[PDB]
Nucleic acid binder design. Sequence first.
RNA 1: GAAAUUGUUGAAAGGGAAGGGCAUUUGAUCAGA
RNA 2: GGAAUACUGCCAGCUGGGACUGAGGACUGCGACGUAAGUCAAGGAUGCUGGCAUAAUGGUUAUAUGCCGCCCGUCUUGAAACACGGACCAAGGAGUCUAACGUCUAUGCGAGUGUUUGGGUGUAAAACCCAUACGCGUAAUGAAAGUGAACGUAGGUUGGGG
RNA 3: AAAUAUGUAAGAAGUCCUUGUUACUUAAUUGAACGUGGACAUUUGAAUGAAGAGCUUUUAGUGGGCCAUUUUUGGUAAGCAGAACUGGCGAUGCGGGAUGAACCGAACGUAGAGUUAAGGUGCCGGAAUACACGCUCAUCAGACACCACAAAAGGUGUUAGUUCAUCUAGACAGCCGGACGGUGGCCAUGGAAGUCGGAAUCCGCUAAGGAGUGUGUAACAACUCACCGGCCGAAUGAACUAGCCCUGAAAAUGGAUGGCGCUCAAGCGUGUUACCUAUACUCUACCGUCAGGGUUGAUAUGAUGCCCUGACGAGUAGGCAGG
RNA 4: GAGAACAGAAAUCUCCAGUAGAACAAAAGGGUAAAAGCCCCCUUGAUUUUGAUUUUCAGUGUGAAUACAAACCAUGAAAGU
RNA 5: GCAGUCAAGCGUUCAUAGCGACAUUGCUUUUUGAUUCUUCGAUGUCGGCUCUUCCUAUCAUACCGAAGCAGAAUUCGGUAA
RNA 6: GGUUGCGGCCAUAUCUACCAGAAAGCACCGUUUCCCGUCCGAUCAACUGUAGUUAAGCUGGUAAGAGCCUGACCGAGUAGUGUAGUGGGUGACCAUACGCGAAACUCAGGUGCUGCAAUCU
Lengths: 185, 159, 58, 172, 183
Amino acid sequence: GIDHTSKQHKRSGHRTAPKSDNVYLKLLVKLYTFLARRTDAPFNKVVLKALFLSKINRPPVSVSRIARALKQEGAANKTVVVVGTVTDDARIFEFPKTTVAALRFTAGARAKIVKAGGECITLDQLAVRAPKGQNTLILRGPRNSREAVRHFGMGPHKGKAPRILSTGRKFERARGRRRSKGFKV
Amino acid sequence: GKSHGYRSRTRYMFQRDFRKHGAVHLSTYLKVYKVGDIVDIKANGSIQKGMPHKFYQGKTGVVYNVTKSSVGVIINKMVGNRYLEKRLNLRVEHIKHSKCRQEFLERVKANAAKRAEAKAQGVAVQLKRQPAQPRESRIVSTEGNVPQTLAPVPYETFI
Amino acid sequence: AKSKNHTAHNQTRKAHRNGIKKPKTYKYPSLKGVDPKFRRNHKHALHGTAKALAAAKK
Amino acid sequence: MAHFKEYQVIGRRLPTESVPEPKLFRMRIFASNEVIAKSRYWYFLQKLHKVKKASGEIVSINQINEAHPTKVKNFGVWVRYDSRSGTHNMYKEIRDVSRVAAVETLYQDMAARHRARFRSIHILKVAEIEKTADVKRQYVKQFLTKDLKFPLPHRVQKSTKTFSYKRPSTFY
Amino acid sequence: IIQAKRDAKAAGSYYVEAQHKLVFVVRIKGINKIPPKPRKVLQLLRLTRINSGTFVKVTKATLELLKLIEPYVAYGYPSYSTIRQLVYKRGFGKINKQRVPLSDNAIIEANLGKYGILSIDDLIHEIITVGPHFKQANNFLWPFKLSNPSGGWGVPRKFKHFIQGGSFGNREEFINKLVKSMN
RNA sequence: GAAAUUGUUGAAAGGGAAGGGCAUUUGAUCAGA
RNA sequence: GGAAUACUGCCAGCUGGGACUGAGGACUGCGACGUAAGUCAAGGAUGCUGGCAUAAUGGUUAUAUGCCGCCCGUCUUGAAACACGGACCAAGGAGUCUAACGUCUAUGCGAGUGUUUGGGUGUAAAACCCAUACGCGUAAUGAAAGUGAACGUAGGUUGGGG
RNA sequence: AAAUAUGUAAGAAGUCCUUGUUACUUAAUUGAACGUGGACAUUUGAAUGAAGAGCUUUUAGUGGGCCAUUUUUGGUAAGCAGAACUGGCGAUGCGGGAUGAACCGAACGUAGAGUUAAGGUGCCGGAAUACACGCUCAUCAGACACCACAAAAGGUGUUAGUUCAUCUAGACAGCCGGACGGUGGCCAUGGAAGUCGGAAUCCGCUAAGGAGUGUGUAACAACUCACCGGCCGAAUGAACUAGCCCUGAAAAUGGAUGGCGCUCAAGCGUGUUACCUAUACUCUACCGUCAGGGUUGAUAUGAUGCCCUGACGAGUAGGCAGG
RNA sequence: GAGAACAGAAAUCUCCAGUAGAACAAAAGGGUAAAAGCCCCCUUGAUUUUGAUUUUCAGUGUGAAUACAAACCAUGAAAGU
RNA sequence: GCAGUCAAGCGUUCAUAGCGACAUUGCUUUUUGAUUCUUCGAUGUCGGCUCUUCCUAUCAUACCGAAGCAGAAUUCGGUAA
RNA sequence: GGUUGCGGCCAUAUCUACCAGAAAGCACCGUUUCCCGUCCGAUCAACUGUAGUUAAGCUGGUAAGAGCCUGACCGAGUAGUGUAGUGGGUGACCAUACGCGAAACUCAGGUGCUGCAAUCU
Ligand SMILES: [K+]
Ligand SMILES: [Mg+2]
Ligand SMILES: [Mg+2]
Ligand SMILES: [Mg+2]
Ligand SMILES: [Mg+2]
Ligand SMILES: [Mg+2]
Ligand SMILES: [Mg+2]
Ligand SMILES: [Mg+2]
Ligand SMILES: [Mg+2]
Ligand SMILES: [Mg+2]
Ligand SMILES: [Mg+2]
Ligand SMILES: [Mg+2]
Ligand SMILES: [Mg+2]
Ligand SMILES: [Mg+2]
Ligand SMILES: [Mg+2]
Ligand SMILES: [Mg+2]
Ligand SMILES: [Mg+2]
Ligand SMILES: [Mg+2]
Ligand SMILES: [Mg+2]
Ligand SMILES: [Mg+2]
Ligand SMILES: [Mg+2]
Ligand SMILES: [Mg+2]
Ligand SMILES: [Mg+2]
Ligand SMILES: [Mg+2]
Ligand SMILES: [Mg+2]
Ligand SMILES: [Mg+2]
Ligand SMILES: [Mg+2]
Ligand SMILES: [Mg+2]
Ligand SMILES: [Mg+2]
Ligand SMILES: [Mg+2]
Ligand SMILES: [Mg+2]
Ligand SMILES: [Mg+2]
Ligand SMILES: [Mg+2]
Ligand SMILES: [Mg+2]
Ligand SMILES: [Mg+2]
Ligand SMILES: [Mg+2]
Ligand SMILES: [Mg+2]
Ligand SMILES: [Mg+2]
Ligand SMILES: [Mg+2]
Ligand SMILES: [Mg+2]
Ligand SMILES: [Mg+2]
Ligand SMILES: [Mg+2]
Ligand SMILES: [Mg+2]
């Protein structure tokens, strides 16, 4: 017998391959597994880990987010890497010329980048251009902007978006939500 | 029925330290508490206002707020399987400055001075405390100290 | 039929299975219960400090 | 406890700045090894003086060998022991060739006759009785008569085999 | 040390030997029915299995741990021969959280070289003489997995104190015989 | 044309149940090389 | 006074007998001996020899022998229970589908999304194509009237992968 | 006023130096908070450890408990009823306690070898009818904790002790002799003379003899004993103490140190070795799980592939995964 | 305790001693002596606004309480409360 | 319910022939309680009749010890179911 | 060093009984028109510092003083207590092992220290 100080046979708790059966995603995973194993560049390892992420862990990165990241001092000529979908954003009226590497581009996002004079490239094209992630800028979309997230941690005095089907007057607003009916929260 | 009041079971906790009853001496009110100061909580039974709950007697916390006659103290309370942040509004008669870090601050100053004198004289610092070490070898003389032989004593009652 | 009334048996074991976790101290703690007069003046002090530091970055 | 050895144990009641060179107390302890000897020394020092192992130190432990291990001696042994209902002092006389052998015999005899375990016995004193007629116990006095001879009737020889073919004899 | 004892005796003094700086502790009790505080102390001394042993540098902080776990361990002062045989036969290093046998000096150099330990004998020296890097060397050493004693425990019952005819507690110099029979 | 249940034949065992586990003896039978 | 011996301990001292194991499968390494060739007990067994070539080993099965072995299911703190169901066998026999939903995951598109109410079409309940709407989302808040999201490089400080 | 338990601190989110903001505060650039700038990494300021840490979501079952040591309440008590801490059983097999949920030991993948735990070694039954010192004879002996009961009080049974005494100037026991005088001491009593009783405890002669140790009388008397002698000649007496044994000790079918049986034990107390064996420890092999890695440079068709390394494996309710 | 007509053993007056052996609404515990007790003077902070916090606790509610803020007041010479 | 230990007293005198206070130690499960462990998909719930066996804390019978046993009768106790 | 005003710690400072106190200070002390308060100028208020005194307050000393404070190889490693055993004991309880460790008692010492400011033979 052994007095175990930790749980035995505990899985790492992190994905080691995508849950997806996309053959092209599996090929990209293979390429970046090779790169992460035989380059020692942290960019390749983080891209390989990002390729495993689920959909809610790969929020879309808008072109406006890419432009704001490129407005960083010294990042104007860096290749923007988004392991996920790049979406369009009509709220920004001036997009700069740049190279964006992403898993997927929305038609509008690709059109905006091309019209601004840049290129939309795949992750294997990015690997060929910069095998060690030279001059790269990894961008991640807002994870906690999800609709599901605001209901997380619901409870007294949390302010955490009760799970409700219809909203308005008569829908969970009287007893426990205001001092005039019993108490507020 | 059962009885769990605010001051239940505080009969000896909140007593006045026999032959130390009456008015609180003025050093308690002349003490100065800044935000971040570490204070020990000990309720004064003669001051019924701003009194801590019995759970916080003997608890040590950090001041987060300073008011006219009271300070706010942050206490980490064990509730279930985790600690919850509690904020107590305690009058200064129920707290005192904690000496749990006076030794640490003096050690900090002494370590700074020792480090400066080390980097001025040579290369040696040894700025970490060490536990009590095993004693080294020593020679014990018998000059004027010849060993006296003892024996266990026989039983007797002497009552 | 009478039953058991109370016991703390196994409660410490349950609490220590997931452990008693210290409450994750942060720098810049919350100013929830801080004296509102101090908070009101602190807001103006920080605003003036920010404006001074912005104007002095030449 | 086991086959005994005798140790002198000298301890110090560790010096301070006010009292350097403390009084260096000594004991003769019968024990099977030095760990037990030191433990017994500290036990009796805690029974006698205001000191404990944490506030004292062992200055010296030395095995004391029998001066004449091949000379037959009469020993008088003063012991104190705890019975089931009280504490009593006893004086016994043991004939042996060494203090350690006499003490082993004493522990065996106390266990046999009074059910006194090792933990319940304090050896107050073991001293050789130099002069006969100061031996006061008949079970030792009977072994000091001039030209003492005695037979060993009914000898029982141990058989190396399960079966014997001779109907053996107990002559001697 | 021998000559200091002889000279003190010749001068009529007593040479009090320096208190031992090193102990070897072997867990002699199973993993069942251990109170939480002694169980935690055993885990922090890496005795998570019966007949597992570790070296402990003696201070007040570790002496109180030994006091807490006394009824479940046999500990004492290991000799050079005991330490050498332990490291030679059952010496394993913790390398990348793995138990790797110390079959070559290159392993010891690659894992303890930054502390000036180049060989298995350098490791043994750092253990026996409690050096500046004793903590790192001892923690690099995987807890020794000893067998049961080959001639038995020498007592009918293990779980009373060594002073009381048992096996646990401080058996100061006899730990060498116990560990050798266990190795 | 199953099983429960039954007859005959053949084999085997059987001092107040039978059945089972590990191991091998003996009898019968059999694969692989 | 000089030893010896006991006891305890040490030797990187020598050596005999017994048992179990032989995993791995070109080389790579660390060593030892040897001046060097090379050899080796040095990152896991090889060498020589004999009998058999089949029920001999072995498997299966029946029996015998040694030791062990309470009747399953269930409720229960506790079942072999003098607690309940079960004489036996075959077949049937118990978390299903739907409406609306939470989390998570996969897929398509993405500030948009949903062709399939319906229309067109068809090799005719399939497949293919489609307008206007509608639903949800892109704005919230207030009981409501109502109002409605950039001082700033959409802020400062701290940590932050890259 | 302890012990145990318990709060806090042991640094870079620190320390030190200079001075910017404020509508707060001060008599006052006084202080408070937040700052800009500058200096200090070998031990960045105790020990030990760290199959890493932190974080989030969503869901099953459960919400009758019970037992053991210790603390403890009610109750005479309970295999009762209720609390505290811990460890367990439930949910757990394995070796031991004959047998048993909880005790001891130890927790479990499939095997081999070795060593042990608790417990044992007369035979059942693997292992010394081993060694050593003693104790016990039971016409109800005794024989390993939990646990399957026994007490007060007793015993010239036997063993070992404590204390106080007597003794060659003659002890104890034993046999024989004396055991007197004042005196029927003073008092109710009907009678009371040493011996129904109250008080008084003397003196003499003494080697010695109580104003009497008992039998006895109505009272006497008569015997007897304390006390002293004669004989003998070396040890003896008393009160206690506690070991084993015995008495105390009585229930119902016939039966239980587990059985047989065991008596310088195969019982009891103690000590020393040797030996036996768990699914426990050590080493190795194989299976699987987890973790860390190597390997798309091809003939390499199995990169969820091949390979290397280390550790781990109990399980009801229940969850998930691969089949 | 010592003193004064009725007036003693209890009436009113005086002094001394008096660490609280009294009193503070109530049960008990704690607290309190130039007071928290007794007497006197003035008053309505037993007011308004909405937050924070402690106990019970799920860190929900309710009750009770704590410390502030923004007003208006009371009291005192004032600090303050 | 039954049995002990002490022994102030009863027993004309005399503790213990027979008793025995004030106390105290036990045994038994033929009383009644206490508890709720077994049984509520069911152990037939009083008493009597009949019949067998077991226990001894023995009423009688056998043999005895003791007495406030002269005999007779009786009482206490032992081996004994 | 004395004294005063304000104090800090709050008896080593308190309590009882005597003794002493130069200078200054403090104090008692003298008066009732005014402000003010009482049954009472006793308290409180005001006025004088003049008429007097160290009697008291106050300060210090004394006492095998009471109390209080400190220390102790004093009691005592005792009581108690954490951990351990298939330890003892019918039990009640007790012993032992590894640790922690009192209180009473006894003895010895001591009897305010000190800050700011002013003033004094
Ligand atoms: K029933
Ligand atoms: Mg395992
Ligand atoms: Mg207190
Ligand atoms: Mg109040
Ligand atoms: Mg319940
Ligand atoms: Mg062996
Ligand atoms: Mg054993
Ligand atoms: Mg047919
Ligand atoms: Mg059939
Ligand atoms: Mg038959
Ligand atoms: Mg030798
Ligand atoms: Mg065969
Ligand atoms: Mg069986
Ligand atoms: Mg039940
Ligand atoms: Mg069952
Ligand atoms: Mg039954
Ligand atoms: Mg049922
Ligand atoms: Mg049925
Ligand atoms: Mg079927
Ligand atoms: Mg239920
Ligand atoms: Mg119950
Ligand atoms: Mg259950
Ligand atoms: Mg178990
Ligand atoms: Mg049994
Ligand atoms: Mg045998
Ligand atoms: Mg007795
Ligand atoms: Mg007469
Ligand atoms: Mg008996
Ligand atoms: Mg036997
Ligand atoms: Mg024996
Ligand atoms: Mg095995
Ligand atoms: Mg892997
Ligand atoms: Mg499993
Ligand atoms: Mg007042
Ligand atoms: Mg309430
Ligand atoms: Mg029926
Ligand atoms: Mg029936
Ligand atoms: Mg009878
Ligand atoms: Mg006047
Ligand atoms: Mg006045
Ligand atoms: Mg005077
Ligand atoms: Mg005095
Ligand atoms: Mg145990």
